[PDB]
Design a protein around this ligand. Structure first.
Ligand code: SF4
Ligand SMILES: [Zn+2]
Ligand SMILES: [Zn+2]
Ligand SMILES: [Zn+2]
Lengths: 130, 512, 166, 97, 443, 86, 44
RNA sequence: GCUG
DNA sequence: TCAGACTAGAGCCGCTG
DNA sequence: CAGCGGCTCTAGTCTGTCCAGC
């Protein structure tokens, strides 16, 4: 019902406890939180002026399923009704990066030789080389 | 001082090699990009738009307005091409039956041709032999396709390769995931294993998982054909210097010069191009509007149909909600047919220095003679080149001029190509200034070799050459002994006359 | 100077059928290849000999006679080792202009290499002092056609000494 | 043009063409069906085999391979209808010898 | 794969010459072709074709075999020619795994193609001594020690036995004592070892530092007992894992055993089939991250979650608006990442159907991006081909006005920005090509 | 008419771009070798020369190029550390 | 197929405007000029 | 539609 | 209007293993 | 006992039907 909402304002609020991560030491298993994330979702996040102070788990879990697609923890045991193992872990990027300026341009893909878009004189590599 | 240059490089055609342009060679021929749908400006000045069709950078088809690219008139200009960008790829309807053939030969997963190494070597050896006929190449292609159509697994990647076949007008389908009474293969089971959420919102998906099959389409087959190895392209019988598999699907389209499609009834060929331009703009707007995929598919299908109709307007399988209300000339319809370029403009064509009249008998003529009326003889002229034997004869003909029968209509100077119309000026001055090498277009006179022909010709004797003799009455006349070759009967019959305009054409007419 | 073997298809118009071919081709080929530099070849001058003249066709159009002609023509092309003798037909401040005597006024020497008293100061000073000799140094020709000069040379003057004239 | 109203002229049909072949009349068939109808010249580039204009080839961006060929205009028209169909007639030209 | 052949024309042009490229690239274009047929079709004289094939068989790019006609048909393997692009990377990991001596061993083995032991140790006795102190001469015995030390870990394998066919001539291939036997480098062992760096960087930059090292020591003790065609590594026990740990670690057996059952049970999964299958999707995801922002990358990961559930959930499962989302789908469609609507089962109707569902196909999006990355290095080299021939006037002046020198340092900034960028796209090739080779049966 | 103005654009600018010269530190090592072997592969024995220049030159003359410590000890060890196939 | 068409045949000769081989086109005419082939050369 |  | 000699399919039965 | 394969058969479809004049 809440189409007049920007969850992109709330995506950082459900992210910043997973960037800090006190006790990164490996003294134990470090089976990591999803219930406290549901706990911080219900009473109070970081501060924001919010019209939907009513707290349902069906409207609050959806910000996670976007943020898994923004590289954050998978679901462990959500088969339970309210309380089970629910293991989670924020995924740091598994690769570096892999591209170049010429990987960005769709129209500049056409060329194949010195032509109208020949790469011997493209603007993009001229921009990248300074 | 000056550099050497050859004066006049006349050459002789040795062969025509047919082929196809790649989409990025089209951009190198074409002089402009065409983007605008409107044929004309709205205001009363009646100019065409700068970047739409009818732009005079692509030539001209009226003497009133010159071409922009070379600044030359209709008579001097060869014409120049533009291009249209297409936002989605489309099948070319002439190459469509060849697109399926390749997809029956190549593996759909890694684009290698599905043949054993020994089979590939045998086919390469058949290609290697010199003197191969065009029929032999077509026969070889059929054999290669048959061997591929009997294999169901690729020797190179291992992926399954079911049947490729047509599934309606300009659509292709591939049975990559067939179902059998025997235990289902893992890949097909994995493909439909768990679309539970899709099943929940779509009732039709759950009952017949097997029916859904790989819908090949221009966005996929263009991506396959870029990946076919150049070693395997000769075994598709494509000549790799005339074209590539990638060139079949077209993401670009040339628009012909204006002289191919002249500005006057009211031109509708330009409207067909405008419809394609309008659809491309609409499809881009729909993508910006975030319209549903089915709406995008319908717009894309319309774009494919319009391009196919533009190349050929005679397609059989057009759905009722897409059929043209009116018939229109596609390119194929102006090539084919009796009025088509091959028969109407090439095999048989209208000729000048020709005449027609009723025929009537005259037995006092010899069998090699035909009476030509003065009204035809004053019109049908022969270019007599001035030389030492005829200078004093042609002077008297120039003096008589256009209105007296042994006379002349035009005079032309030695190294000049304009013609002085001899009705004006003082002809006794133009007769004195005859030089050797001038051309006098004298009237037809007694002893001209003239061709004579009845309209239906069943044998060679229906057209013969006769010596003209000028006589006052309007009919063509010949001795009735020559009625049997022409099958003429003097009952208001008409016959044709042709005046050969060349000395070499006189001799071949007279002797043969 | 160097001979250049060339092959041309020479068209004799049919009002010259009285004259002998090897003469009447030669009158045409002089009108085809005189005072004309051929790119990468040199400045053609005249006709040396016609080494092979083959048979006179007559084509389905013209009625003229087209004989393919092998010949040799003398051309002008310095060999990058020639000390020529010309005349200064012009002096520019960037470099002198020498001309071979009524041959071609198109040889343009750049002047940087003679003795350290070198300038042309626009009052037609040849050289600040201590027929004219020339060393042709590079071949340089530019094909003219480009849209809908040409043998220029660069010419040197080293420490020759020039005993007769400075 | 087509007829008497338009001062049209007369047709050498496909059947009259068959008559003239049987006489062996090769030059008369060239005079009637090329010279006195639709004689034309095209610039042909010997490198790519396409048609050009004014001694210039836009495809190659060069001026040196272009040559003039005597062609019927209806065949030039055919060679531009076919390219828009993406059937490319790439010509090769020898000298006339 | 025409852009692949675009590179083999570029790679031979810069390294050896032009006719060795031409006769080379034609052989890639027409395949199993005899000696006289190659010289007639490329328009090359037969003396130069015999030399050009002689250099090509030396660097192991063209392989010859006769079957029936008694006439040898040469044949060039395409994928070997692109491995020249990885050549300085093949140098570097022999510096991390061996000394400067053995790093020079794989260098002149990659450079001069086929080498005997009696030559390659004699050559590095020249190069390493001329850079070391005179009078402090490097002793060649340590070279022969590290020469076999490469071979016990099987980084250098020997050439297959020569056919010695009558058409083939023995005297021409060697360049001018003992004969010995020849070898190339085992670059296939590198493609394991480059994959060994790939998985250990995949775990360390995702899980933890201590998780990756036990993957490394698992794979370091499974080198000879597998090959590249192994679907996964040889199975090991956890007790020899505690034996094979490095001496830098001090972790107790039972805590790492908890991490061992942690690392065995992941979404990542040592399953070498799943390892390159998971690393390839991150290479895909790092390209949409490179190109279409994090918003389109968010729906790109959504189709890797659900196979065929699309356009009735993708407006909901990412919460981005319908206008902004549907341009990201059609841009993922038009650039062939989103693959297609393989679920429509209503008959022949774009308007009336069972609703087309998007679905990523991982290999069609793989083979395109590999074809794209082959196209990419064509635009890299040709620029460095472009900027070279102009500036040759001032390279020899050092061997000079202020814009003259400034053009050189903008050249040398450019070339070093180009040549470094040939390698950063090169690591995307191998990361995807090893995924290509892992899903290809019967090869 | 909405697009009938000019060539769409001389170029289309993508609001997001390339990241950087990625992997900045360590490819200084490979990057010099890119230029090192290219200095040595061109100046190698395994290359060809333009003998078409010399057949093009009819100006051949004299005085031009157109006209004109390994400290080691013996040993012998031949290892089969490698494959025994093919 | 990328087929190349020989312009030798009768029908394509009439299309292209070149004279057909059969009939009067089968042979060539040489002019009987008073010529001396391989003429005396100027000695160097 | 008719003439050819 | 009237074939008409192509192009896939649906089988079919019976050896072909 | 089962599976290619060619046969064999429907039947499906696209392709022509003189020259010319007004
Ligand atoms: S350089 Fe060549 S390839 Fe790289 S972007 Fe510009 S055009 Fe496309
Ligand atoms: Zn024009
Ligand atoms: Zn395959
Ligand atoms: Zn061209």
């Amino acid at each position: 019902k809440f189409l007049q909402s920007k969850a992109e304002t709330a995506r950082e609020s459900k992210q910043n406890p997973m960037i800090q991560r006190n006790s990164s030491f490996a003294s134990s298993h470090e089976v990591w939180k999803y219930i406290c994330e549901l706990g911080i979702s219900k009473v109070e996040l970081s501060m924001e002026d919010i019209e939907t102070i009513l707290n349902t788990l069906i409207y609050d879990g959806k910000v996670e399923m976007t943020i898994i697609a923004a590289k954050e923890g998978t679901v462990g045991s959500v088969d339970g009704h309210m309380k089970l193992y629910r293991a989670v872990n924020p995924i740091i990027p598994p690769t570096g990066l892999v591209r170049a300026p010429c990987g960005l341009c769709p129209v500049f893909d056409d060329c194949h030789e010195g032509g109208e878009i020949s790469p011997s004189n493209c603007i993009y590599m001229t921009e990248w080389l300074e | 001082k000056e550099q050497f240059r050859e004066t006049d490089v006349a050459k002789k055609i040795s062969h025509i090699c047919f082929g196809m342009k790649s989409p990025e060679e089209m951009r190198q021929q074409a002089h402009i990009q065409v983007v605008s749908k409107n044929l004309y400006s709205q205001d009363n000045q009646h100019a065409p738009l700068l970047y739409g069709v009818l732009d005079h950078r692509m030539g001209t088809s009226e003497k009133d307005r010159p071409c922009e690219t070379c600044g030359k008139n209709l008579a001097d200009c060869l014409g120049h091409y533009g291009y249209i960008d297409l936002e989605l790829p489309c099948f070319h309807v002439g190459y469509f039956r060849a697109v399926i053939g390749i997809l029956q030969m190549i593996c759909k997963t890694c684009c290698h041709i599905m043949l054993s190494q020994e089979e590939k070597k045998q086919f390469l050896d058949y290609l290697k032999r010199p003197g191969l006929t065009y029929l032999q190449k077509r026969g070889l292609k059929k054999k290669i396709s048959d061997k591929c159509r009997k294999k169901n697994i690729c020797h190179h990647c291992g992926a399954f390769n079911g049947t490729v076949k047509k599934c309606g007008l300009l659509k292709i389908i591939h049975e990559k995931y067939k179902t059998n009474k025997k235990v289902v293969d893992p890949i097909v089971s994995n493909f439909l294993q768990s679309f539970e959420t899709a099943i929940e919102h779509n009732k039709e998906v759950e009952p017949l998982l097997g029916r859904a099959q790989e819908n090949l389409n221009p966005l996929v087959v263009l991506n396959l054909f870029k990946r076919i190895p150049a070693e395997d392209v000769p075994l598709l019988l494509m000549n790799p210097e005339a074209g590539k598999p990638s060139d079949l699907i077209l993401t670009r389209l040339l628009v012909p010069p204006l002289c191919i499609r002249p500005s006057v009834n009211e031109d509708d060929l330009t409207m067909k191009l405008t419809e394609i331009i309008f659809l491309n703009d609409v499809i881009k707007k729909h993508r910006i509007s975030g319209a549903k995929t089915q709406m995008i598919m319908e717009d894309w299908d319309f774009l494919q149909l319009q391009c196919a109709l533009y190349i050929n307007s005679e397609l059989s399988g057009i759905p009722l909600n897409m059929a043209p209300k009116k018939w229109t000339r596609g390119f194929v319809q102006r090539l084919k047919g009796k009025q088509g370029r091959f028969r109407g403009n090439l095999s048989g064509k209208r000729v000048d220095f020709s005449g027609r009249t009723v025929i009537s008998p005259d037995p006092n003529l010899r069998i090699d003679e035909v009476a030509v009326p003065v009204h035809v003889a004053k019109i049908l002229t022969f270019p007599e080149k001035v030389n030492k034997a005829n200078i004093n004869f042609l002077r008297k003909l120039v003096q008589n001029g256009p209105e007296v029968h042994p006379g002349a209509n035009f005079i032309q100077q030695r190294h000049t190509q304009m013609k002085r119309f001899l009705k004006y000026g003082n002809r006794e001055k133009m007769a004195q200034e005859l030089k050797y090498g001038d051309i006098v277009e004298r009237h037809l006179i007694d002893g001209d070799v003239v061709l004579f022909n009845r309209q239906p010709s069943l044998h060679k004797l229906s057209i013969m050459a006769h010596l003209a003799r000028v006589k006052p009455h309007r009919t063509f006349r010949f001795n009735e002994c020559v009625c049997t070759p022409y099958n003429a009967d003097f009952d208001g019959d008409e016959m044709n006359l042709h005046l050969p305009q060349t000395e070499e054409a006189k001799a071949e007419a007279l002797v043969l | 100077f160097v001979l250049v073997e060339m092959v041309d298809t020479v068209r004799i118009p049919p009002w010259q059928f009285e004259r002998k071919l090897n003469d009447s081709i030669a009158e045409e080929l002089n009108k085809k290849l005189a005072n004309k530099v051929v790119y990468n070849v040199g400045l053609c001058i005249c006709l040396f000999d016609i080494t092979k003249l083959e048979d006179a066709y007559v084509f389905p159009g013209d009625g003229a006679s087209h004989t393919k002609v092998h010949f040799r023509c003398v051309v002008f092309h310095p060999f990058l080792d020639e000390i020529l003798i010309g005349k200064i037909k012009g002096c520019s401040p960037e470099g002198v202009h020498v001309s071979l005597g009524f041959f071609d006024d198109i040889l343009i020497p750049p002047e940087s290499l003679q003795q350290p008293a070198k300038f042309d100061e626009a009052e037609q000073v040849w050289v600040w002092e201590y027929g004219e000799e020339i060393r042709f140094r590079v071949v340089d020709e530019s094909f003219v056609d480009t849209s809908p000069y040409t043998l220029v040379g660069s010419i040197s003057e080293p420490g020759l000494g020039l005993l007769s004239w400075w | 043009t087509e007829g008497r109203s338009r001062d049209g002229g007369l047709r050498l049909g496909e059947m009259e063409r068959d008559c003239l072949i049987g006489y062996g009349a090769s030059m008369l068939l060239l005079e009637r069906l090329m010279i006195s109808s639709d004689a034309f010249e095209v610039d042909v580039c010997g490198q790519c085999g396409l048609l050009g204009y004014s001694g210039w080839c836009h495809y190659c961006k060069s001026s040196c391979h272009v040559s003039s060929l005597r062609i019927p205009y209806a065949c030039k028209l055919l060679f531009q209808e076919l390219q828009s169909m993406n059937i490319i007639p790439r010509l090769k030209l020898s000298k006339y010898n | 794969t025409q852009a692949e052949i675009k590179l083999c024309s570029l790679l031979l042009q810069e390294h050896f010459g032009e006719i060795v490229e031409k006769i080379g690239v034609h052989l890639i274009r027409t395949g199993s072709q005899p000696l006289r047929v190659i010289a007639h079709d490329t328009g090359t004289s037969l003396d130069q074709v015999k030399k050009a094939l002689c250099v090509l068989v030396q660097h192991n790019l063209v392989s010859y075999q006769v079957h029936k006609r008694g006439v040898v048909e040469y044949e060039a393997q395409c994928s070997r020619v692109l491995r020249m692009l990885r050549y300085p990377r093949y140098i570097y990991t022999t510096k991390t795994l061996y000394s400067d001596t053995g790093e020079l061993i794989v260098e002149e083995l990659l450079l001069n193609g086929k080498l005997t032991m009696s030559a390659v140790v004699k050559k590095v006795a020249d190069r390493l001594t001329e850079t070391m102190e005179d009078g402090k001469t490097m002793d060649y015995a340590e070279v022969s020690n590290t020469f076999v030390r490469l071979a016990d870990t099987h980084f250098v394998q020997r050439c297959p036995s020569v056919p010695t066919t009558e058409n083939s001539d023995p005297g021409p291939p060697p360049p001018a004592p003992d004969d010995g036997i020849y070898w190339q480098a085992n670059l296939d062992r590198f493609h394991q070892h480059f994959r060994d760096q790939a998985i250990v960087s995949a775990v360390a930059n995702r899980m933890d530092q201590t998780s990756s090292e036990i993957v490394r020591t698992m794979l370091r003790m499974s080198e000879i007992t597998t090959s590249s065609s192994a679907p996964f590594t040889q199975p090991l026990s956890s007790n020899e894992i505690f034996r094979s740990l490095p001496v830098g670690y001090n972790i107790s057996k039972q805590v790492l055993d908890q991490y061992l059952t942690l690392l065995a049970d992941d979404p990542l999964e040592i399953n070498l089939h799943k390892a390159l299958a998971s690393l390839a999707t991150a290479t895909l995801e790092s390209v949409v991250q490179e190109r279409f922002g994090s918003r389109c990358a968010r729906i790109f990961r959504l189709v890797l979650q659900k196979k065929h559930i699309e356009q009735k959930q993708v407006e909901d499962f990412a919460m981005i608006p319908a206008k902004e989302a549907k341009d990201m789908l059609y841009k993922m469609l038009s650039e062939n990442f989103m693959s297609l609507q393989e679920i429509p089962k209503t008959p022949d109707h774009a308007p009336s159907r069972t609703f087309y569902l998007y679905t990523v196909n991982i290999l069609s999006a793989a083979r395109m991006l590999l074809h794209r990355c082959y196209k990419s290095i064509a635009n890299l080299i040709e620029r460095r081909q472009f900027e070279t021939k102009e500036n040759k006037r001032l390279l020899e002046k050092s061997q000079i006005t202020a814009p003259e020198r400034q053009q050189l340092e903008t050249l040398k900034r450019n070339v070093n920005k180009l040549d470094a960028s040939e390698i950063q796209v090169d690591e995307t090739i191998f990361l995807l090509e090893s995924y290509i080779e892992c899903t290809m049966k019967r090869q | 008419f909405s697009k009938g103005e000019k060539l769409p654009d001389v170029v289309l600018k993508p609001p997001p771009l390339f990241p950087d010269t990625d992997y900045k530190p360590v490819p200084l090592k490979t990057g010099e070798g890119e230029e090192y072997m290219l200095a040595l592969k061109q100046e190698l024995r395994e290359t060809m020369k333009r003998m078409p220049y010399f057949i093009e030159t009819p100006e051949e003359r004299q005085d031009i190029e157109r006209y004109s410590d390994w400290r080691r000890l013996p040993r012998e060890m031949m290892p089969r550390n490698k494959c025994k196939k093919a | 197929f990328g087929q190349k068409d020989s312009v030798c045949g009768v029908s394509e000769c009439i299309i292209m405007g070149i004279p057909m081989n059969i009939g009067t086109g089968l042979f060539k005419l040489l002019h009987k000029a008073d010529r001396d082939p391989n003429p005396p050369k100027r000695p160097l």
